[PDB]
RNA sequence: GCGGCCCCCUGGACGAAGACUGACGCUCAGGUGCGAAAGCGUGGGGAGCAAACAGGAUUAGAUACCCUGGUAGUCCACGCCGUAAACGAUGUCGACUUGGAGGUUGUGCCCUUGAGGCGUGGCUUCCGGAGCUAACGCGUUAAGUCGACCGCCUGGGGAGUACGGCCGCAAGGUUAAAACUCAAAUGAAUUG
């Protein structure tokens, strides 16, 4: 619906997270999905197969509109990040951008220390 | 050499992002890259080249 | 059952505020959920008719998760407790062990006790039963016996106490 | 870091920019902070790889 | 111990030729100052995560190894504290003694003619001669041969504590305690 050929695909691959979100310029909700919402509770959520199944999950949740291409907000070096896009780019549509928006803070804050393992 | 007004020539020594290329690749003398880095930072202050290319 | 996985001809649909919507087509509910911009979860598929509850997706998800999670933490705080006892007991480290054991028991945790007999006690089970009685003797009003030992398994003993509950 | 990636490649080809961003250092500082140790660990590859 | 860019004071360091003073030098007992971080006093802040502390999982467990919060605290203002594996585990100053491969900094000349040689200093690493060492190793910046002057050591544990004194209300810091016990604690190097 209302093809514009430009939009945003926010993706964030974390150690226990990987998601895709679809929106246009303004940001009224269009589509999104969560790997945790796809199941895979435990150490399975961000796994590449869970990553890619959530990817085609989000894609299917957003195929209703049929617009040609968007931007991809690539974020998070967590597990996956490739099976996600590999399931996404396989949609057949055109892709416009790949951007690792993950900032480079320069002496920002002191992070935690406790974890020994 | 001691100049800073050759941003076109200076652009050869920066990355696509404009990041600071070590002499390990370029092979320039340390004295020269010192002044070059000074000039690059000052140009960055003047917004001739951005902090990074995603701006 | 999600989206097209729903197969029951008639389902019981209730509104967000709890109004009785009766039995309606799944298409209208799916359209309302899609406009509601979130995911769809069905609770009980095996019921006839299946029960469907509509609330914003992870709002209700993690609210019920909070309820279950706090109910899980309602159970007693679990470390693991086990301190051995030996008949070859000295003067004060006896009290050290006794204080450790009562400290762990006052924590209200499950019982876990292992007792090793010193060597040749299999022919001298009298000292073992006597020291066990003395444990009962020193825990007359302090501990309660659940099972009385009659058989020796290797060099230790399998026995479980019970917590004193105010009844 | 913004690039206009297209269909056929479908994978990577951003090694230079990924190395520049280098999320590993921020991941490591996320857990524990030291301020001192890496200096000792270095100066070994150059010293060893000579013959 | 010191790293973005600007503006005021600047012990140093070496290269050049010249210049004039004419021994004016070294260690320096006590004495004097500086001095990692934590911490303690009065004023503002907590993005930061974490001391304690709060919720959970855990084996033979002992507040434990991981999770979610979290106070001091770290930053500027003044004072105190003066200790650290404050180690190159090498007190300071001067003189002599095989050779090589480095970077780094500078002047002189001749082809700067590109990215050569020359004499430069200070450090840097790898070497390794002789020599020195118990060995490991060190090895023109010697742990080589000498010179001059301070500091410090005399078995182990007892013990950097007993006391006194000194300094700091504060935490503590320097001077140093025997009786008793042991026949040993050691350092480097060969087979699993």
DSSP string, C35-103: HTTS----SBSSSSSPEEE---HHHHHHHHHHHHHHHHHTSPP-------B-SS--SSHHHHHHHHHHH
Return all residues near A115 (Cβ < 8 A) that are at least 6 apart. Answer: D31, D32
Return all residues near B49 (Cβ < 8 A) that are at least 6 apart. Answer: B7, B11, B14, B18, B40, B43
Residues of A in contact with D4 (CB under 8 A): 96-97
- Give the residue from A88, A62, A81, A61 showing the smallest Cα distance to A17: A81
CA distance A101 to D11: 17
Residues of A in contact with C58 (CB under 8 A): 37
CA distance A44 to C89: 51
A94 and D10 within 8 Å at the Cβ level: the answer is no
DSSP per residue, A4-58: -S--EEEEEE-SS-EEEEEE-SS----EEEETGGGS-TTTTTTSHHHHHHHHHHH
Strand E contact with B24 (CB < 7 A): no
Q: Residue C51 forms beta bridges with which residues?
A: C12, C44
Q: Residue A8 forms beta bridges with which residues?
A: A23, A71
D1 and A77 within 8 Å at the Cβ level: the answer is no
Q: What's the gap in Å between the CA of D11 and the closest CA on chain B?
A: 20
Place of tokens 């931007």: A71
Of how many residues is chain D composed?
Answer: 51
Q: How many CA atoms lie within 13 A of B34 on its CB side?
A: 3
A115 φψ region: left (φ > 0), alpha (ψ -120 to 50), beta (else): beta
Resolution (A): 4.4
CA angle D10, D23, B23 (to 5 degrees): 95
Strand E contact with B55 (CB < 7 A): no
Q: Residue C85 forms beta bridges with which residues?
A: C115
CA distance A46 to A55: 11
Q: What's the gap in Å between the CA of A26 and the closest CA on chain D?
A: 20
- Give the residue from A95, A25, A26, A27 showing the smallest Cα distance to A59: A95
CA distance D2 to A101: 8
Domain that holds residue A93: 2-117
The values of phi and psi at residue B5, to 5°, are -100, 20
DSSP per residue, chain D: --B---TTT-S---HHHHHHH-HHHHHHHHS---SSSHHHHSSSHHHHS--
- The domain total for chain A is 1
Using CA atoms of A62, A65, A70, A76 in order, give the dihedral in degrees to the nearest 10. -10
CA distance A77 to C164: 53
Quick check: C67 and C99 in contact, CB under 8 A?
A: no
CA distance C130 to C87: 10
| Technique of determination | cryo-EM
DSSP state of C111: P
Peptide bond into A46 cis (omega under 30): no
């Amino acid at each position: 619906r209302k093809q514009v050929s430009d939009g945003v695909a926010h993706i964030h691959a974390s150690f226990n997270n990987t998601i895709v979100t679809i929106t246009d310029r303004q940001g009224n909700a269009l589509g999104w999905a969560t790997a945790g919402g796809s199941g895979f509770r435990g150490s399975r959520k961000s796994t590449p197969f869970a990553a890619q199944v959530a990817a085609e999950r989000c894609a299917d949740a957003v195929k209703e509109y049929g617009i040609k291409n968007l931007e991809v907000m690539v974020k998070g070096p967590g597990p996956g990040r490739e099976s996600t896009i590999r399931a996404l780019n396989a949609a057949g549509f055109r892709i416009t951008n790949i951007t690792d928006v993950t900032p480079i803070p320069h002496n920002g804050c002191r992070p935690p220390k406790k974890r020994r393992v | 050499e001691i100049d800073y007004k050759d941003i076109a020539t200076l652009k050869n020594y920066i990355t696509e992002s404009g990041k600071i290329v070590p002499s390990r690749i370029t092979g320039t003398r340390a004295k020269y890259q010192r002044q070059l880095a000074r000039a690059i930072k000052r140009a960055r202050y003047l917004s001739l080249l951005p902090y990074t290319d995603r701006h | 059952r999600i989206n097209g996985e729903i197969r029951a001809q008639e389902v019981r649909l209730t509104g967000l505020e709890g109004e009785q919507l009766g039995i309606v087509s799944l298409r209208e509910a799916l359209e309302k959920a899609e406009e509601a911009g979130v995911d769809l979860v069905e609770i009980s598929p095996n019921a006839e008719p299946p029960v469907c509850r509509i609330m914003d997706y992870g709002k209700f998800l993690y609210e019920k998760s909070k309820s279950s999670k706090e109910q899980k933490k309602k159970q007693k705080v679990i470390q693991v407790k086990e301190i051995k006892f030996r008949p070859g007991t000295d003067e004060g480290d006896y009290q050290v062990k006794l204080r450790s054991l009562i400290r762990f028991l006052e924590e209200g945790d499950k019982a876990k006790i292992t007792l090793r007999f010193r060597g040749r006690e299999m022919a001298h089970q009298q000292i073992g039963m006597e020291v066990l009685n003395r444990v009962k003797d020193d825990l007359q009003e302090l501990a309660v016996v659940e099972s009385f030992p009659t058989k020796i398994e290797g060099r230790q003993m399998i026995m479980v106490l019970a917590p004193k509950k105010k009844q | 870091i913004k690039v206009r990636e297209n269909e056929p490649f479908d994978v990577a080809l951003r090694r230079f920019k990924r190395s520049c961003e280098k999320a590993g250092v921020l991941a490591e500082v996320r857990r524990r902070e030291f301020y001192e140790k890496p200096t000792t660990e270095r100066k070994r590859a150059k010293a060893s790889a000579v013959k």
